[PDB]
A paper describes a structure:
The femtomolar affinity of [name]/avidin for biotinylated targets, combined with resilience to harsh conditions and an on-rate of ~ 107 M− 1 s− 1, is the basis for biotin's central role as a specific biological “glue” in diverse research methods and biotechnologies. We previously generated [name] heterotetramers with exactly one, two, or three functional biotin-binding sites, through purifying tetramers containing defined numbers of non-biotin-binding “Dead” and His6-tagged wild-type subunits. However, tetramers with two functional and two Dead subunits can assemble in three different arrangements. To generate a controlled and stable bridge for bionanotechnology, we demonstrate here a method for the simple isolation of [name] variants with precise cis-divalent or 1,3 trans-divalent arrangements.
In the 1,2 arrangement the biotin-binding sites of [name] are in a cis configuration as the binding sites both point in the same direction. To isolate cis-divalent [name] (1,2 arrangement of biotin-binding subunits), we introduced a series of aspartates into the loop between β-strands 3 and 4 (L3,4) of the Dead subunit. Introduction of the charges in this position means that in the 1,3 and 1,4 arrangements, these charged regions should be far apart, while in the 1,2 arrangement, the charged loops should be apposed. Since L3,4 is important for biotin binding affinity, it was necessary to insert these residues on the Dead subunit, so that the cis-divalent [name] could maintain high biotin binding affinity. Overall, the introduction of a series of negative charges into the surface-exposed 3,4-loop of [name] allowed the isolation of a second divalent species, cis-divalent. However, one condition obtained using the Morpheus crystal screen yielded the desired asymmetric unit for the cis-divalent [name] containing all four subunits. The obtained 1,3 trans-divalent crystal structure was solved at 1.6 Å resolution, and cis-divalent [name] was solved at 1.4 Å resolution, with the phases in each case solved using molecular replacement. For the putative cis-divalent sample, the electron density closely fits if chains a/c are Dd and chains b/d are SA, also confirming that the biotin-binding subunits indeed had a cis orientation. Furthermore, while the electron density around L3,4 could be clearly observed in the SA chains b and d of the cis-divalent form, the electron density of L3/4 was poorly defined in Dd chains a and c. The engineered L3,4 of Dd (chains a/c) is expected to be highly flexible, which would lead to weak diffraction in this region.
Numbering used by the authors:
A (entry chain A): 14 to 46, 49 to 135
B (entry chain B): 16 to 136
C (entry chain C): 14 to 46, 49 to 134
D (entry chain D): 16 to 135
């Protein structure tokens, strides 16, 4: 409380580090599976979650530009943090690429990822 | 182009600032849902978009807690800014509520919002 | 009287023709924007909708294979029918392409489309 | 390999037949939600998939009305069949409820279900 701050691991090797601020801020760095693969992460979480067995709602964005590379796209992850011995962040995500109007219908991928505090 | 006050199709107000760096900051006031007054938002955008007529990718998050209410929820919007005569931000969103594990299957709503610098209707 | 049977037009050129069966069946053809561009459509709808002003829930699928082409992908539309002078079907959709596991993370596009009875 | 009885991670039962012409037919019984007993499903699949190691694209719909209950809603699953050691159907789904116009923004739930021929 909160157990969100720290390092989180996805199934296929992505890793992020985040600080959950007392004001509801999420800030950190996302590393897609060196610094060439590291991107700024910024989001928000419920800083006063229920203590009734529910998850803690959250979301964040990564725009896939850094000093080295730029995919002209951005992912947002929406989900909840589930605490305990096997804590997890369960998310669904949208990845939108910049497109022309003609190609806008195929601008956005949807998917899901779970993150854990230990490597899977 | 992104910095300014935007309105979605339902009348919600999105006041955003785009930093030189890729940062989005601002406030969101929803016209619908378990929400009242302004909420903080943060996000990111592509600060060096392509020069081929493509839009500018972006996204942001609102956690639906402020000094007055808490819905134990958060929405993320993912989309692109399209400049021109009439600038638009076209998005799809995910709204996740805290749930127990048994109810996690019904935790997340999906939708689509289009933002313009004029109020709707 | 479901009001669904007939021809529907998407905002960007696509057309479909559907029959709403008394039992909840949707059956028809989707033409993408031309038999080369026509595909089988099948789905289901709520044949006894609420009478409180709510729309009529429905969904359908098109696999993008016909006798001429195969994109190795399928779209599902999930939405609701709203009747009246300006009847419409408001949908959100998921398009999944067959991929290897390594590429599964980019298998599925999401979007939305509204269909009307006039172009 | 699609024809058969499948279960998702919640214990829902998906009984499906794949027709030579690309048709999917069968029944769905949900372990969760406003649902009782079997519901009719129909859908489509790619009857001539790639041979390059890709999965087989498919989708289906259930309207949540049967002779017992009506939830005024429909779910569509969009995904792919992955033949493997243990065969799997990986999906994402959209559940839309009939709503008034004022509530249309909250009409649609999204999630992801994985189906195997084994029940959890």
């Amino acid at each position: 409380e909160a157990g969100i701050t720290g390092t989180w691991y996805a199934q296929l090797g992505d890793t992020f580090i985040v600080t959950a601020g007392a004001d509801g801020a999420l800030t950190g760095t996302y590393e897609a599976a060196g610094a060439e693969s590291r991107y700024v992460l910024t989001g928000r979480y419920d800083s006063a979650p229920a203590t009734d067995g529910s998850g803690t709602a959250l979301g964040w964005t990564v725009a896939w530009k850094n000093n080295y590379r730029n995919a002209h796209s951005a992912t947002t992850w929406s989900g909840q943090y589930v605490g305990g011995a096997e804590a997890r962040i369960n998310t669904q995500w949208l990845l939108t690429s910049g497109t022309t109007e003609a190609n806008a219908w195929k601008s956005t991928l949807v998917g899901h990822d779970t993150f854990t505090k230990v490597k899977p």
